[PDB]
Amino acid sequence: IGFIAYLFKIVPSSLVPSEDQGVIMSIINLPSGSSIHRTIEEVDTINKNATQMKEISSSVSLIGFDLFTSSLKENAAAVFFILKDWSQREASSDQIIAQLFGQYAADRNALSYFLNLPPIPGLSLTGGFEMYAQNKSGKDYDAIQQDVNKMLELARTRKELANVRTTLDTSFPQYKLIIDRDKMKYYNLNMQDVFNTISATIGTYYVNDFPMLGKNFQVNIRALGDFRNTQDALKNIYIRSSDNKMIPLNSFLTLVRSAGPDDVKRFNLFPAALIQGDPAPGYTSGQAIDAIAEVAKQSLGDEYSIAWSGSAYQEVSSKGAGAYAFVLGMIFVFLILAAQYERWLMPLAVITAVPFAVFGSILLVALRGFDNDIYFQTGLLLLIGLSAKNAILIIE
Amino acid sequence: SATIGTYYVNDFPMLGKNFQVNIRALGDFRNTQDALKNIYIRSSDNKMI
Amino acid sequence: IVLVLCAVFIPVSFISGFVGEIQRQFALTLAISVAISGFVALTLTPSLS
Amino acid sequence: PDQAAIDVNNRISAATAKLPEAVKKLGVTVRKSSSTILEVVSVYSEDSSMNDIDIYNYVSLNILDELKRIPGVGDASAIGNKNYSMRIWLEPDLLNKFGVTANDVINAVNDQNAQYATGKIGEEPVVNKSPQVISITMQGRLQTPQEFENIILRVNEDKSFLRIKDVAKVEIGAEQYNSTGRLNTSAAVPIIINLQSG
Amino acid sequence: TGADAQTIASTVATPIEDAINGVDNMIYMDSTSSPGQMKLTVYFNIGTDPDQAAIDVNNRISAATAKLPEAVKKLGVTVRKSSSTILEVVSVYSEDSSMNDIDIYNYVSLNILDELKRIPGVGDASAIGNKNYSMRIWLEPDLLNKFG
Amino acid sequence: NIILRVNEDKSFLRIKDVAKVEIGAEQYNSTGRLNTSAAVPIIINLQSGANAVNTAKLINEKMQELSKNFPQGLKYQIPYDTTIFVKASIKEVIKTFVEALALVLVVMYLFLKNFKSTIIPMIAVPVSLLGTFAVLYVLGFSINLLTL
């Protein structure tokens, strides 16, 4: 019994083992500033290098599309690699992922993470765990940015975590327009007219629909290419005052550069970032989750509170339920054995066979290196039943 | 509605949440029954009535 | 034997959750299978033998 | 109750268009009043340092949301109905003196204090194919009483701007002063909590 | 159409998030704001029926519509039962390369996407990109200024 | 040909003069690719509480029907689908079932010399399994790899 306790202590935990689904999804995140054509080039190069590997059969890419949030970002790109059939290929998915990482370690410009599909599709899209650093007392997202940077560094310091990354990014370049209200009104210009001109010339202005091939399609108005680019747009645009005099927009509008986050996320009414990490090879999902929780508690301040999602939330919420079900089943087995046998004591002897089955299961799993998981607990429950059955044969 | 009553023009930001902007005449003027005398309107001919 | 097997499987039915559904699938399947097999052993098997 | 609420919501959704402009702007709310009160947490200022408005807004911003988080709390709502608002107090005598009516003030406030959209520089339909795309941000919103006081109603023939500060007094106050809540002598705001069903 | 994510989050997500808060059997809630769009995802317990969950979310948002600042743009507001799982991805690719991406996308959206939506057991069928036909009008600022 | 101004010479000023009009995409930001070829990938979200395999069969059939009507030089490929994994796993589990049944037969014959003694429990096995399926139908529990 003591050995059973020790083995249970030493066995790693994880909700579900990593499965080889035959599809490798790669998330390519170009720097924030870079536009779509750069991502097209990088994704094409990634496909060209990957398709050379024989195990990978075909690749389907989603350029300009953020896979996990479904957002449409110019820099983000998502690439799925379809492997050969399991019978055909000899190298498992994880080995191909490692080979691809080795191949593309050289590419400094583009950050690429190769991840296997989650064993349970429903819980989450990313195979790795999902952790959120909620800031209860935060004020601005730049503070969040440097705090999560420290947290991510300390996460990569640990061995139990691999491919740790954060969705939040405040390095995006932005332009802030400052309206000189005094001068604008001195020019007898309505604010809304100026902002309509800005929206139409720089952005797309949806005016109304027009009919084509039956369905109604939008009509959009925008400036022509180069005029938007180079930060000199305002000089070319003109707005007419109430006196019917052309007024260049550069007179009362100034464009000042700045940096601010593109995407802003809130979780349970708290600004937060999304920290997603893939458990390192040789360590299970439970170990990685415990490790990242510890790193979050240490590096991040006491203001930050960790919340779970997807598979990590399932595991953290369902911990101990298996043990509770096991003990409840044992007590009901005791009661039914006592009822059938009509003697209180003998059910104790019947139960005492269960520890042998539990010891065998845990010992063999520990020897094979397998980790504790839901399937392990179900197996333990059924073996509780089978050991009991052997005990009934002898005691009756 | 702007002088005697409250006119909800638009929202303004404060403490992260949007709060109303309301225009009303100073309470001293609108309390009497003769409040209408002090109020004036433009007659669309650049004349106050 | 059938009683001991179904008794251990019954408490699984009550617990609900992500683990609850997974364990309950096995609980139900094994329980019904053992029940039918026990009925067979009680009745059909001796007659056939 | 959920079925009744959803059909009532669906019907008022179709009926919303017929209503006047102001009702549509404020919106029509559908809720279920079946549940009864569980308690009435009254928050009072013993020293009277903070007036009813501050107590009501602090409770709404910081207290109410926390109580909503508590499990089993179906609803939480204060009774004051006095949230913050940039009240602009017009002075008819000054308005008459400066030749500006309330309609001009309404137009100026509506026009100047408003955030509209903007595009992004360097988007894909470009010959240049610029290295990076930069998103234009243009707020155009006022958030302080000093900023509101600087709204320009009219520009005189002499180049001196007429502003709301000349013809009104701007301050932050409650949206409505019709109600007041007092526990004993001290002012307060009553927070009513309805138990979650089941 | 256009805006910054910070303002959208703080003004829109929070008043809606509190309104949703307290919904029956919500394991967790998350919101994400992007330039021109806001996405709010609400999750529920495994046993909770997503249909009744959507009904209750609609009830709560209706009740709290008073504290809502989404009024500036009412052209699109959606509450949809969402499924994380994607059954499959179908790539419609032209051999001859005669049709460019825009034409292929428009043809797919017109013909195949609707029929797939109809097919039973399909919760949603969507195509990446929004490259629908549109009557783009490219203003020329030089000529626009020249003609007044 | 939309008219902007009369021009007081009775010569209308039209949008053609100040802008160029062309039909194009609403947004050109995102593009999809299948291998080197360009394509529009459509993602099919399984409806909550729906069968994946049956839907996939329905989709594949419908997409074949539409493929009959595709314009010249158009092909469809389903690079990624979750139904293939399910089918492979189910077939593997069936093979495991057959192997286990054969092993049980061998053990039973080894222990009980007579053939009849071996078949009698072996013919007791199918009735129990089939009854399990029947009660699964009564209780409305979907067949999973867990059940197998």
PDB file of N, CA and C in Angstrom, chain E residues 83 85-96 101 104-105 107-108 112 115-116 118 121-136 138 140 143 147, chain F residues 5 17-28 30-31 39-47 52 55 59 62 66 69-73 75-83:
ATOM      1  N   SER E  83     -19.645  26.897 -32.954  1.00  0.00           N
ATOM      2  CA  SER E  83     -19.018  25.600 -32.741  1.00  0.00           C
ATOM      3  C   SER E  83     -17.525  25.735 -32.994  1.00  0.00           C
ATOM      4  N   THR E  85     -15.372  23.231 -33.221  1.00  0.00           N
ATOM      5  CA  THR E  85     -14.951  22.199 -34.157  1.00  0.00           C
ATOM      6  C   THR E  85     -15.269  22.604 -35.589  1.00  0.00           C
ATOM      7  N   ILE E  86     -14.333  22.328 -36.491  1.00  0.00           N
ATOM      8  CA  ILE E  86     -14.541  22.486 -37.924  1.00  0.00           C
ATOM      9  C   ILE E  86     -14.476  21.099 -38.545  1.00  0.00           C
ATOM     10  N   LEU E  87     -15.557  20.704 -39.216  1.00  0.00           N
ATOM     11  CA  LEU E  87     -15.631  19.351 -39.753  1.00  0.00           C
ATOM     12  C   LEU E  87     -14.566  19.119 -40.813  1.00  0.00           C
ATOM     13  N   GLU E  88     -14.361  20.088 -41.698  1.00  0.00           N
ATOM     14  CA  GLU E  88     -13.394  19.935 -42.775  1.00  0.00           C
ATOM     15  C   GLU E  88     -13.202  21.285 -43.448  1.00  0.00           C
ATOM     16  N   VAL E  89     -12.197  21.348 -44.314  1.00  0.00           N
ATOM     17  CA  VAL E  89     -11.896  22.533 -45.102  1.00  0.00           C
ATOM     18  C   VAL E  89     -11.826  22.118 -46.560  1.00  0.00           C
ATOM     19  N   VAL E  90     -12.612  22.777 -47.405  1.00  0.00           N
ATOM     20  CA  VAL E  90     -12.673  22.477 -48.829  1.00  0.00           C
ATOM     21  C   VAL E  90     -12.043  23.636 -49.582  1.00  0.00           C
ATOM     22  N   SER E  91     -11.017  23.340 -50.370  1.00  0.00           N
ATOM     23  CA  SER E  91     -10.324  24.341 -51.166  1.00  0.00           C
ATOM     24  C   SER E  91     -10.817  24.253 -52.602  1.00  0.00           C
ATOM     25  N   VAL E  92     -11.442  25.323 -53.078  1.00  0.00           N
ATOM     26  CA  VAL E  92     -11.916  25.414 -54.452  1.00  0.00           C
ATOM     27  C   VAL E  92     -10.828  26.112 -55.254  1.00  0.00           C
ATOM     28  N   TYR E  93     -10.143  25.354 -56.105  1.00  0.00           N
ATOM     29  CA  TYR E  93      -8.982  25.838 -56.837  1.00  0.00           C
ATOM     30  C   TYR E  93      -9.196  25.616 -58.324  1.00  0.00           C
ATOM     31  N   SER E  94      -8.845  26.618 -59.126  1.00  0.00           N
ATOM     32  CA  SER E  94      -9.048  26.572 -60.569  1.00  0.00           C
ATOM     33  C   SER E  94      -7.781  26.067 -61.248  1.00  0.00           C
ATOM     34  N   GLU E  95      -7.940  25.089 -62.139  1.00  0.00           N
ATOM     35  CA  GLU E  95      -6.785  24.513 -62.820  1.00  0.00           C
ATOM     36  C   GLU E  95      -6.173  25.504 -63.803  1.00  0.00           C
ATOM     37  N   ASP E  96      -7.008  26.122 -64.643  1.00  0.00           N
ATOM     38  CA  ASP E  96      -6.497  26.951 -65.730  1.00  0.00           C
ATOM     39  C   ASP E  96      -5.906  28.267 -65.243  1.00  0.00           C
ATOM     40  N   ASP E 101      -8.556  35.123 -57.556  1.00  0.00           N
ATOM     41  CA  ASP E 101      -9.119  34.786 -56.253  1.00  0.00           C
ATOM     42  C   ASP E 101     -10.488  35.422 -56.054  1.00  0.00           C
ATOM     43  N   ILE E 104     -13.222  33.482 -58.031  1.00  0.00           N
ATOM     44  CA  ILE E 104     -13.478  32.186 -57.415  1.00  0.00           C
ATOM     45  C   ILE E 104     -14.263  32.363 -56.125  1.00  0.00           C
ATOM     46  N   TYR E 105     -13.870  33.337 -55.300  1.00  0.00           N
ATOM     47  CA  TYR E 105     -14.582  33.550 -54.044  1.00  0.00           C
ATOM     48  C   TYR E 105     -16.031  33.925 -54.299  1.00  0.00           C
ATOM     49  N   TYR E 107     -17.917  33.291 -56.953  1.00  0.00           N
ATOM     50  CA  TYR E 107     -18.657  32.142 -57.458  1.00  0.00           C
ATOM     51  C   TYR E 107     -18.977  31.163 -56.339  1.00  0.00           C
ATOM     52  N   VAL E 108     -17.994  30.873 -55.485  1.00  0.00           N
ATOM     53  CA  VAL E 108     -18.225  29.954 -54.378  1.00  0.00           C
ATOM     54  C   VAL E 108     -19.338  30.480 -53.487  1.00  0.00           C
ATOM     55  N   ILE E 112     -22.058  27.612 -53.995  1.00  0.00           N
ATOM     56  CA  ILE E 112     -21.811  26.437 -53.166  1.00  0.00           C
ATOM     57  C   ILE E 112     -22.077  26.719 -51.693  1.00  0.00           C
ATOM     58  N   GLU E 115     -25.838  26.372 -50.554  1.00  0.00           N
ATOM     59  CA  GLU E 115     -26.286  24.986 -50.541  1.00  0.00           C
ATOM     60  C   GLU E 115     -25.673  24.230 -49.374  1.00  0.00           C
ATOM     61  N   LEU E 116     -24.389  24.464 -49.095  1.00  0.00           N
ATOM     62  CA  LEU E 116     -23.776  23.827 -47.935  1.00  0.00           C
ATOM     63  C   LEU E 116     -24.446  24.280 -46.644  1.00  0.00           C
ATOM     64  N   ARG E 118     -27.473  24.919 -46.197  1.00  0.00           N
ATOM     65  CA  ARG E 118     -28.710  24.139 -46.130  1.00  0.00           C
ATOM     66  C   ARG E 118     -28.496  22.703 -45.684  1.00  0.00           C
ATOM     67  N   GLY E 121     -26.819  19.212 -40.498  1.00  0.00           N
ATOM     68  CA  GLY E 121     -25.633  18.937 -39.711  1.00  0.00           C
ATOM     69  C   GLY E 121     -24.526  19.935 -39.954  1.00  0.00           C
ATOM     70  N   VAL E 122     -24.760  20.904 -40.827  1.00  0.00           N
ATOM     71  CA  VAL E 122     -23.767  21.936 -41.036  1.00  0.00           C
ATOM     72  C   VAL E 122     -24.248  23.112 -40.233  1.00  0.00           C
ATOM     73  N   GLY E 123     -23.426  23.562 -39.302  1.00  0.00           N
ATOM     74  CA  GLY E 123     -23.808  24.674 -38.462  1.00  0.00           C
ATOM     75  C   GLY E 123     -23.498  25.941 -39.205  1.00  0.00           C
ATOM     76  N   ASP E 124     -22.333  25.982 -39.840  1.00  0.00           N
ATOM     77  CA  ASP E 124     -21.976  27.154 -40.624  1.00  0.00           C
ATOM     78  C   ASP E 124     -20.949  26.758 -41.671  1.00  0.00           C
ATOM     79  N   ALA E 125     -21.005  27.423 -42.822  1.00  0.00           N
ATOM     80  CA  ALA E 125     -20.015  27.260 -43.880  1.00  0.00           C
ATOM     81  C   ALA E 125     -19.595  28.644 -44.342  1.00  0.00           C
ATOM     82  N   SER E 126     -18.316  28.966 -44.171  1.00  0.00           N
ATOM     83  CA  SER E 126     -17.804  30.291 -44.482  1.00  0.00           C
ATOM     84  C   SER E 126     -16.497  30.161 -45.245  1.00  0.00           C
ATOM     85  N   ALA E 127     -16.161  31.216 -45.981  1.00  0.00           N
ATOM     86  CA  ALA E 127     -14.944  31.275 -46.776  1.00  0.00           C
ATOM     87  C   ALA E 127     -14.040  32.377 -46.245  1.00  0.00           C
ATOM     88  N   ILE E 128     -12.757  32.054 -46.064  1.00  0.00           N
ATOM     89  CA  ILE E 128     -11.795  33.053 -45.618  1.00  0.00           C
ATOM     90  C   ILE E 128     -11.745  34.201 -46.613  1.00  0.00           C
ATOM     91  N   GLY E 129     -11.540  35.405 -46.090  1.00  0.00           N
ATOM     92  CA  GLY E 129     -11.600  36.607 -46.891  1.00  0.00           C
ATOM     93  C   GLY E 129     -13.017  37.120 -47.014  1.00  0.00           C
ATOM     94  N   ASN E 130     -13.114  38.392 -47.380  1.00  0.00           N
ATOM     95  CA  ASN E 130     -14.393  39.024 -47.673  1.00  0.00           C
ATOM     96  C   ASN E 130     -14.377  39.563 -49.089  1.00  0.00           C
ATOM     97  N   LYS E 131     -13.766  38.815 -50.003  1.00  0.00           N
ATOM     98  CA  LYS E 131     -13.536  39.305 -51.353  1.00  0.00           C
ATOM     99  C   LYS E 131     -14.780  39.178 -52.219  1.00  0.00           C
ATOM    100  N   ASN E 132     -15.908  39.685 -51.738  1.00  0.00           N
ATOM    101  CA  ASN E 132     -17.107  39.740 -52.553  1.00  0.00           C
ATOM    102  C   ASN E 132     -16.993  40.873 -53.561  1.00  0.00           C
ATOM    103  N   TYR E 133     -17.711  40.736 -54.668  1.00  0.00           N
ATOM    104  CA  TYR E 133     -17.753  41.805 -55.652  1.00  0.00           C
ATOM    105  C   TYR E 133     -18.227  43.090 -54.992  1.00  0.00           C
ATOM    106  N   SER E 134     -17.615  44.205 -55.375  1.00  0.00           N
ATOM    107  CA  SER E 134     -17.995  45.511 -54.859  1.00  0.00           C
ATOM    108  C   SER E 134     -17.575  46.564 -55.867  1.00  0.00           C
ATOM    109  N   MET E 135     -18.403  47.594 -56.018  1.00  0.00           N
ATOM    110  CA  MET E 135     -18.180  48.617 -57.036  1.00  0.00           C
ATOM    111  C   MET E 135     -17.185  49.643 -56.492  1.00  0.00           C
ATOM    112  N   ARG E 136     -15.924  49.225 -56.427  1.00  0.00           N
ATOM    113  CA  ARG E 136     -14.884  50.111 -55.926  1.00  0.00           C
ATOM    114  C   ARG E 136     -14.788  51.348 -56.804  1.00  0.00           C
ATOM    115  N   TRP E 138     -12.315  54.519 -57.208  1.00  0.00           N
ATOM    116  CA  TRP E 138     -10.993  55.006 -56.832  1.00  0.00           C
ATOM    117  C   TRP E 138     -10.909  56.489 -57.174  1.00  0.00           C
ATOM    118  N   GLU E 140      -9.292  60.063 -57.579  1.00  0.00           N
ATOM    119  CA  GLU E 140      -7.969  60.587 -57.873  1.00  0.00           C
ATOM    120  C   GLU E 140      -7.851  61.967 -57.248  1.00  0.00           C
ATOM    121  N   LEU E 143      -7.005  64.923 -59.846  1.00  0.00           N
ATOM    122  CA  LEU E 143      -8.134  65.342 -60.670  1.00  0.00           C
ATOM    123  C   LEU E 143      -9.267  65.874 -59.805  1.00  0.00           C
ATOM    124  N   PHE E 147     -10.834  69.593 -60.633  1.00  0.00           N
ATOM    125  CA  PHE E 147     -12.205  69.889 -61.025  1.00  0.00           C
ATOM    126  C   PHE E 147     -13.019  70.551 -59.922  1.00  0.00           C
TER     127      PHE E 147
ATOM    128  N   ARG F   5     -21.928  67.711 -61.065  1.00  0.00           N
ATOM    129  CA  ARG F   5     -22.141  69.146 -61.148  1.00  0.00           C
ATOM    130  C   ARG F   5     -22.522  69.513 -62.573  1.00  0.00           C
ATOM    131  N   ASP F  17     -14.617  61.435 -64.872  1.00  0.00           N
ATOM    132  CA  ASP F  17     -13.584  62.459 -64.979  1.00  0.00           C
ATOM    133  C   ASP F  17     -12.686  62.477 -63.749  1.00  0.00           C
ATOM    134  N   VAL F  18     -13.263  62.293 -62.559  1.00  0.00           N
ATOM    135  CA  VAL F  18     -12.520  62.464 -61.312  1.00  0.00           C
ATOM    136  C   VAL F  18     -12.120  61.149 -60.663  1.00  0.00           C
ATOM    137  N   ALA F  19     -12.551  60.011 -61.199  1.00  0.00           N
ATOM    138  CA  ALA F  19     -12.238  58.735 -60.576  1.00  0.00           C
ATOM    139  C   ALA F  19     -12.352  57.633 -61.615  1.00  0.00           C
ATOM    140  N   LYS F  20     -11.746  56.494 -61.301  1.00  0.00           N
ATOM    141  CA  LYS F  20     -11.837  55.294 -62.120  1.00  0.00           C
ATOM    142  C   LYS F  20     -12.655  54.253 -61.372  1.00  0.00           C
ATOM    143  N   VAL F  21     -13.629  53.667 -62.058  1.00  0.00           N
ATOM    144  CA  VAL F  21     -14.576  52.735 -61.460  1.00  0.00           C
ATOM    145  C   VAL F  21     -14.276  51.342 -61.989  1.00  0.00           C
ATOM    146  N   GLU F  22     -14.194  50.372 -61.082  1.00  0.00           N
ATOM    147  CA  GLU F  22     -13.914  48.996 -61.456  1.00  0.00           C
ATOM    148  C   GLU F  22     -14.462  48.072 -60.381  1.00  0.00           C
ATOM    149  N   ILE F  23     -14.913  46.899 -60.805  1.00  0.00           N
ATOM    150  CA  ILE F  23     -15.460  45.916 -59.878  1.00  0.00           C
ATOM    151  C   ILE F  23     -14.309  45.149 -59.248  1.00  0.00           C
ATOM    152  N   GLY F  24     -14.271  45.129 -57.920  1.00  0.00           N
ATOM    153  CA  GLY F  24     -13.191  44.492 -57.201  1.00  0.00           C
ATOM    154  C   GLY F  24     -13.677  43.971 -55.869  1.00  0.00           C
ATOM    155  N   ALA F  25     -12.751  43.386 -55.120  1.00  0.00           N
ATOM    156  CA  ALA F  25     -13.091  42.795 -53.838  1.00  0.00           C
ATOM    157  C   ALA F  25     -13.341  43.870 -52.789  1.00  0.00           C
ATOM    158  N   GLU F  26     -14.165  43.524 -51.800  1.00  0.00           N
ATOM    159  CA  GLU F  26     -14.373  44.414 -50.665  1.00  0.00           C
ATOM    160  C   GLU F  26     -13.091  44.575 -49.857  1.00  0.00           C
ATOM    161  N   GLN F  27     -12.366  43.480 -49.629  1.00  0.00           N
ATOM    162  CA  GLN F  27     -11.080  43.517 -48.944  1.00  0.00           C
ATOM    163  C   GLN F  27     -10.103  42.604 -49.667  1.00  0.00           C
ATOM    164  N   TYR F  28      -8.894  43.102 -49.912  1.00  0.00           N
ATOM    165  CA  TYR F  28      -7.839  42.332 -50.554  1.00  0.00           C
ATOM    166  C   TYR F  28      -6.795  41.830 -49.564  1.00  0.00           C
ATOM    167  N   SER F  30      -6.603  39.227 -47.248  1.00  0.00           N
ATOM    168  CA  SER F  30      -6.322  37.817 -47.020  1.00  0.00           C
ATOM    169  C   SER F  30      -6.465  37.017 -48.306  1.00  0.00           C
ATOM    170  N   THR F  31      -5.569  36.052 -48.489  1.00  0.00           N
ATOM    171  CA  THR F  31      -5.630  35.116 -49.600  1.00  0.00           C
ATOM    172  C   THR F  31      -5.355  33.711 -49.086  1.00  0.00           C
ATOM    173  N   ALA F  39      -6.343  29.280 -54.060  1.00  0.00           N
ATOM    174  CA  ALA F  39      -7.683  28.747 -53.870  1.00  0.00           C
ATOM    175  C   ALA F  39      -8.378  29.525 -52.765  1.00  0.00           C
ATOM    176  N   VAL F  40      -9.694  29.358 -52.693  1.00  0.00           N
ATOM    177  CA  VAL F  40     -10.510  29.920 -51.624  1.00  0.00           C
ATOM    178  C   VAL F  40     -10.902  28.773 -50.693  1.00  0.00           C
ATOM    179  N   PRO F  41     -10.381  28.716 -49.468  1.00  0.00           N
ATOM    180  CA  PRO F  41     -10.735  27.610 -48.573  1.00  0.00           C
ATOM    181  C   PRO F  41     -11.966  27.953 -47.749  1.00  0.00           C
ATOM    182  N   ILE F  42     -12.957  27.068 -47.782  1.00  0.00           N
ATOM    183  CA  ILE F  42     -14.202  27.240 -47.044  1.00  0.00           C
ATOM    184  C   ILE F  42     -14.197  26.260 -45.884  1.00  0.00           C
ATOM    185  N   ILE F  43     -14.477  26.761 -44.687  1.00  0.00           N
ATOM    186  CA  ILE F  43     -14.434  25.967 -43.466  1.00  0.00           C
ATOM    187  C   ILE F  43     -15.858  25.662 -43.032  1.00  0.00           C
ATOM    188  N   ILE F  44     -16.105  24.408 -42.676  1.00  0.00           N
ATOM    189  CA  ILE F  44     -17.443  23.910 -42.393  1.00  0.00           C
ATOM    190  C   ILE F  44     -17.499  23.569 -40.911  1.00  0.00           C
ATOM    191  N   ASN F  45     -18.206  24.383 -40.135  1.00  0.00           N
ATOM    192  CA  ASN F  45     -18.315  24.176 -38.698  1.00  0.00           C
ATOM    193  C   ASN F  45     -19.462  23.215 -38.422  1.00  0.00           C
ATOM    194  N   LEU F  46     -19.153  22.099 -37.769  1.00  0.00           N
ATOM    195  CA  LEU F  46     -20.183  21.132 -37.427  1.00  0.00           C
ATOM    196  C   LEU F  46     -21.169  21.740 -36.440  1.00  0.00           C
ATOM    197  N   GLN F  47     -22.456  21.568 -36.725  1.00  0.00           N
ATOM    198  CA  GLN F  47     -23.490  22.051 -35.825  1.00  0.00           C
ATOM    199  C   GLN F  47     -23.381  21.346 -34.478  1.00  0.00           C
ATOM    200  N   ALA F  52     -20.672  13.872 -37.099  1.00  0.00           N
ATOM    201  CA  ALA F  52     -19.640  14.339 -38.020  1.00  0.00           C
ATOM    202  C   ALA F  52     -19.615  13.512 -39.300  1.00  0.00           C
ATOM    203  N   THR F  55     -22.642  14.011 -41.744  1.00  0.00           N
ATOM    204  CA  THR F  55     -22.588  15.315 -42.382  1.00  0.00           C
ATOM    205  C   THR F  55     -21.549  15.316 -43.484  1.00  0.00           C
ATOM    206  N   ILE F  59     -22.003  16.231 -47.311  1.00  0.00           N
ATOM    207  CA  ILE F  59     -21.257  17.301 -47.950  1.00  0.00           C
ATOM    208  C   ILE F  59     -20.563  16.769 -49.188  1.00  0.00           C
ATOM    209  N   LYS F  62     -23.022  16.341 -51.957  1.00  0.00           N
ATOM    210  CA  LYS F  62     -23.483  17.618 -52.490  1.00  0.00           C
ATOM    211  C   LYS F  62     -22.389  18.295 -53.303  1.00  0.00           C
ATOM    212  N   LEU F  66     -22.391  19.531 -57.186  1.00  0.00           N
ATOM    213  CA  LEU F  66     -21.998  20.859 -57.650  1.00  0.00           C
ATOM    214  C   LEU F  66     -20.812  20.785 -58.607  1.00  0.00           C
ATOM    215  N   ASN F  69     -21.487  20.771 -62.063  1.00  0.00           N
ATOM    216  CA  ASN F  69     -21.848  22.066 -62.630  1.00  0.00           C
ATOM    217  C   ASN F  69     -20.737  23.105 -62.535  1.00  0.00           C
ATOM    218  N   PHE F  70     -19.524  22.714 -62.161  1.00  0.00           N
ATOM    219  CA  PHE F  70     -18.459  23.691 -62.002  1.00  0.00           C
ATOM    220  C   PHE F  70     -18.152  24.352 -63.343  1.00  0.00           C
ATOM    221  N   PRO F  71     -17.657  25.589 -63.345  1.00  0.00           N
ATOM    222  CA  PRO F  71     -17.207  26.185 -64.604  1.00  0.00           C
ATOM    223  C   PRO F  71     -15.914  25.534 -65.058  1.00  0.00           C
ATOM    224  N   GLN F  72     -15.620  25.675 -66.348  1.00  0.00           N
ATOM    225  CA  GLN F  72     -14.432  25.061 -66.921  1.00  0.00           C
ATOM    226  C   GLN F  72     -13.182  25.488 -66.163  1.00  0.00           C
ATOM    227  N   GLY F  73     -12.364  24.506 -65.798  1.00  0.00           N
ATOM    228  CA  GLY F  73     -11.129  24.774 -65.090  1.00  0.00           C
ATOM    229  C   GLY F  73     -11.314  25.026 -63.608  1.00  0.00           C
ATOM    230  N   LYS F  75     -11.699  22.833 -59.781  1.00  0.00           N
ATOM    231  CA  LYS F  75     -11.641  21.576 -59.051  1.00  0.00           C
ATOM    232  C   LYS F  75     -11.727  21.872 -57.562  1.00  0.00           C
ATOM    233  N   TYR F  76     -12.205  20.887 -56.808  1.00  0.00           N
ATOM    234  CA  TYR F  76     -12.349  20.998 -55.364  1.00  0.00           C
ATOM    235  C   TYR F  76     -11.543  19.896 -54.698  1.00  0.00           C
ATOM    236  N   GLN F  77     -10.832  20.250 -53.635  1.00  0.00           N
ATOM    237  CA  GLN F  77     -10.064  19.302 -52.847  1.00  0.00           C
ATOM    238  C   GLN F  77     -10.349  19.553 -51.376  1.00  0.00           C
ATOM    239  N   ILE F  78     -10.496  18.475 -50.615  1.00  0.00           N
ATOM    240  CA  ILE F  78     -10.742  18.573 -49.180  1.00  0.00           C
ATOM    241  C   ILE F  78      -9.462  18.160 -48.468  1.00  0.00           C
ATOM    242  N   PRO F  79      -8.476  19.051 -48.340  1.00  0.00           N
ATOM    243  CA  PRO F  79      -7.205  18.624 -47.741  1.00  0.00           C
ATOM    244  C   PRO F  79      -7.348  18.123 -46.320  1.00  0.00           C
ATOM    245  N   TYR F  80      -8.128  18.807 -45.488  1.00  0.00           N
ATOM    246  CA  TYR F  80      -8.238  18.484 -44.072  1.00  0.00           C
ATOM    247  C   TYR F  80      -9.691  18.185 -43.744  1.00  0.00           C
ATOM    248  N   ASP F  81      -9.927  17.038 -43.114  1.00  0.00           N
ATOM    249  CA  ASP F  81     -11.252  16.660 -42.649  1.00  0.00           C
ATOM    250  C   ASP F  81     -11.104  15.757 -41.436  1.00  0.00           C
ATOM    251  N   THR F  82     -12.007  15.926 -40.474  1.00  0.00           N
ATOM    252  CA  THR F  82     -11.966  15.130 -39.257  1.00  0.00           C
ATOM    253  C   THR F  82     -12.629  13.772 -39.411  1.00  0.00           C
ATOM    254  N   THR F  83     -13.373  13.548 -40.495  1.00  0.00           N
ATOM    255  CA  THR F  83     -14.076  12.281 -40.649  1.00  0.00           C
ATOM    256  C   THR F  83     -13.115  11.150 -40.988  1.00  0.00           C
TER     257      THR F  83
END
